[PDB]
Design a binder for this molecule. Structure first.
Ligand SMILES: COc1cccc(S(=O)(=O)N(CC(=O)O)c2cccc(-n3ncc(C(=O)O)c3C3CC3)c2)c1
Length: 289
């Protein structure tokens, strides 16, 4: 009990510093301490009850600065603290947590599209590079299932991708998995039960409302019910057995819509609205502040 969905950063006209937390138990939103530096295209995650904001870019009227930053938010104090920075700036990043360690995957630095991957050790406050992906990927969806790390879709600098790959930590090795049925860059990727879900994204022509899931045992991708809204650069998380998608861009509007997927009924429903429309947020779940 007592866990909230935190959304950090994002974009609307410029990169944002907002940290806001939604309580599914009562529908309330809380505005919390702003990020020290505005950022869009970041990712969020939680280790040990602390929220981490990783990478992104500060797009402002006076600049576009890609971020190598790792910042830690403590709900007990409502304060952000800098942690060790990554080896390289990573905008349009994806992240995943394995056994208390944060993996930062891909992303861009200027016109460079990274295949590199690095791993953070909170206990030592250190990053170290691990094996790079087989493909350069920005706008990459990342999730962890059964202590394996998945990198899904994205953009390699020439093509948006339907491909996906998996990292096996004990071998420090990446291997391709079955590709998705749809090209997706800037999708929301998460894990629910024994499947990796890829929701939304951009296929090179349109923002998508379709959603597909990879069953790690059968190695197949299957479509589930589509979202009500097409969206790219959405936030996503799982809470109490349901997927939540937050914001994104539908080709016309920066959405404030938050939708919730119930896997038992295979249905999406609108559950709340963010306080303002935005895309490119980082999202994670931890205890209320
Ligand atoms: C029109 O304004 C917009 C519209 C949507 C999002 C933003 S954003 O400020 O949130 N943002 C812009 C940036 O960093 O350029 C961002 C963040 C994460 C990933 C991605 N991402 N990565 C690759 C692709 C693709 O086109 O294949 C995309 C885009 C999402 C499909 C972009 C600004």
């Amino acid at each position: 009990v007592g866990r909230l969905i935190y959304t950090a950063g994002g974009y609307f006209r410029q990169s944002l510093s907002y940290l806001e937390a939604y309580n599914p138990s009562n529908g309330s939103w809380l505005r919390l301490a702003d990020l020290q530096v505005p950022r869009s295209g970041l990712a969020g995650c939680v280790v040990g009850g602390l929220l981490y904001a990783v990478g992104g870019r500060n797009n402002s009227p006076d600049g576009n600065t890609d971020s190598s930053a790792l910042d830690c938010y403590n709900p007990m104090t409502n304060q952000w603290s800098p942690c060790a920075s990554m080896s390289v700036p990573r905008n349009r990043i994806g992240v995943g947590v394995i056994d208390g360690h944060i993996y930062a995957v891909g992303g861009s630095h200027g016109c460079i599209h990274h295949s590199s991957v690095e791993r953070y050790e909170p206990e030592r406050d250190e990053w170290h590079l691990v094996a790079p992906m087989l493909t350069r990927r920005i706008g990459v969806g990342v999730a962890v299932l059964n202590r394996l790390l998945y990198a899904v879709g994205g953009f390699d600098g020439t093509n948006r991708l339907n491909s996906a790959e998996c990292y096996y930590p004990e071998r420090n090795e990446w291997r391709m998995i079955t590709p998705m049925n749809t090209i997706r860059s800037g999708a929301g990727v998460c894990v629910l039960h024994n499947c990796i879900y890829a929701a939304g994204g951009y296929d090179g022509q349109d923002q998508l409302n379709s959603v597909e899931r990879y069953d790690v045992e059968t190695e197949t991708w299957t479509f589930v019910a589509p979202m009500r809204h097409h969206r790219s650069a959405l936030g996503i998380t799982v809470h109490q057995g349901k997927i939540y998608v937050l914001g994104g861009y539908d080709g016309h509007t920066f959405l404030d819509s938050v939708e919730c997927y119930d896997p038992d009924s295979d249905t999406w429903s609108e559950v709340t609205r963010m306080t303002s429309g935005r895309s490119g947020v980082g999202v994670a779940v931890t205890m209320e502040p």
